[PDB]
Design a protein around this ligand. Structure first.
Ligand SMILES: [Zn+2]
Length: 198
């Protein structure tokens, strides 16, 4: 749960999106227990990107070793309630682009956001990840949450980077306008342990 001031800040930051502009959505974790969400507007580079601590541990451990490589300890300090707070304040009758719409449709429906429509780009597996290596080379710094060795040894899946590479595959080039986060780190994470005095 967010505070009154955190709520005002998020809504204010979210209004930076153009409600009509092309907007991607991607998620890591199952739709009833998501761990990473990304909403991205390729034209202006703006993105909403946050995390969530999981409730089902056994699945999470499976998803960590075979998909996202996230260590659960790195999620202990993330701000709770962001998933419902974000989804609630997305514009009325918004349209979202995505790769595989099944899970995202379930997630939006669970939030009573049936008014939000999805466009599944439905690319083939490898066509969607053509520019995976280049996107990781350039934008790895944007998300350091994928620390574990993933096996299917492969590149971990990041909700954010997946949006960027899906846009890249659609346009045919890894050349996109610079991605910029719309959320402050102080909203995504809880102030962590105090600095070790050195
Ligand atoms: Zn990530």
């Amino acid at each position: 749960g967010l505070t009154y001031s955190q709520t005002m800040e998020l809504k204010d930051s979210m209004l930076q999106l153009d409600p009509n502009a092309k907007t991607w959505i991607d998620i890591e974790g199952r739709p009833e227990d998501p761990v990473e969400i990304a909403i991205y507007q390729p034209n202006n580079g703006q993105y909403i990107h946050f995390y969530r601590e999981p409730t089902d541990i056994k699945q999470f451990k499976q998803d960590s070793k075979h998909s996202h490589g996230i260590d659960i300890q790195d999620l202990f300090s993330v701000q709770p309630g962001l998933t419902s707070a974000v989804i609630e304040s997305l514009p009325k009758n918004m349209v979202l682009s995505c790769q595989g719409a099944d899970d995202i449709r379930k997630l939006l429906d669970s939030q009573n956001r049936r008014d939000i429509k999805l466009i599944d780009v439905s690319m083939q597996k490898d066509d969607a990840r053509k520019f995976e290596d280049k996107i990781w080379d350039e934008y790895k710094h944007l998300c350091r949450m994928h620390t574990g060795i993933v096996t299917q040894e492969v590149t971990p899946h990041c909700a954010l980077l997946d949006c960027l590479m899906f846009e890249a595959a659609v346009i045919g080039s890894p050349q996109i306008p610079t991605p910029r986060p719309v959320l402050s780190r102080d909203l995504v994470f809880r102030t962590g342990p105090p600095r070790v005095v050195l």
